[PDB]
Symmetry: D2
Subunit: 117 residues, 4 copies
């Protein structure tokens, strides 16, 4: 259910593979930020989710460095995959920039991303 191409509401594109070993691999292309072109992502997901019918927990990270640019920052998405005819991957994320210790207080942005097929 997770393997595939996914899109968030910012227009970003999440390309991923969910391996049988609980691993997540692919690329992310931000529609915003100090970004351009695809960035490597990787993460993990629950390969044996609950019987009851709850979403499948997962999470992944992108460090915003690629051959084209480096924003000295990383985002992690934490959320759950939700099957349906309207499958969704519902996330909250944390984006931390490298800062001096003085500015550490403002190092991290927080947001929410909803991904659709």
């Amino acid at each position: 259910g997770i393997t595939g191409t996914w899109y968030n509401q910012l227009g970003s594109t999440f390309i991923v593979t969910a391996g049988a070993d609980g691993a997540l691999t692919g690329t992310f292309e931000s529609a915003v930020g100090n970004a351009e072109s695809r960035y490597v992502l990787t993460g993990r997901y629950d390969s044996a989710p609950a019987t009851d019918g709850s979403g499948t927990a997962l999470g992944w990270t992108v460090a915003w460095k690629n051959n084209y640019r480096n924003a000295h920052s990383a985002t992690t998405w934490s959320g759950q995959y939700v099957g349906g005819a309207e499958a969704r991957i519902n996330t909250q994320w944390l984006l931390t920039s490298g800062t001096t210790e003085a500015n550490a207080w403002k190092s991290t942005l927080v947001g929410h991303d909803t991904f659709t097929k």
Copy 2:
């Protein structure tokens, strides 16, 4: 650097390998919550950090399933590594549990972990 065995304020053990490609790989062992023994982890980090004094942005994910147990959940840690004198990794984290859609408002915990050696 970032490669090594680290411990957070809770006494959790974070065993990690920072690859020249920007990969993070190791194991996480949780002192608390619905967990036992080590869990696979994967993440990303800025392989070419700023030099002026900024920390090195990083992130990683744990899906809380292994050979012994499954919490049907996953945490992502987002933070910056601060090295030199007493190296530190300062993070913020999101722990998302699979849930029913009606319980989704209460799927995600938020916190902060600080790690040293």
Copy 3:
């Protein structure tokens, strides 16, 4: 334009008054969790927002104690009012529960609520 009766995506009811000094006062009624009927809320908003299309920052707090129940918890919403046809209030919130110190790591839930009238 903040003064009014708002509903979030969960169906909870936010009845607010934005005073001329920057105060938010009213009641919150949650459709979910360990709550029933109305709770006092209080908070602040930017009385002089910029005039560049930027939204209006605000925040409020509810302690989940009232004459019928006490969950021994508090939520705070931080966000901005967005004017227009579809006037909206977009927030992120933090729900802290009184825990012991050993359980504090899991004291705080995080989410995001969008309100309309």
Copy 4:
């Protein structure tokens, strides 16, 4: 145990009164950011906490507008008060700044502040 003067790790000064009804009122002075002098705060706390050694849930909001300047932004702190010889208020916070809708994705900073007497 909450009424009085408290200090966070960043130097800021939180002067607060916890009223009998669960009211938090007072004033915040920030050592950091787009702030000068003191700002009004208001919030709520659990005035009937548990007796099982659990902490006391509370939160407050600051809108960063006062007589001297306006950052067009607001912070909410959500946390719990822990008394004893080593009394503290442990919080996590969300700082939302007014922004256009296109920049809403980067509107909110998240962090944590520990307050001491």
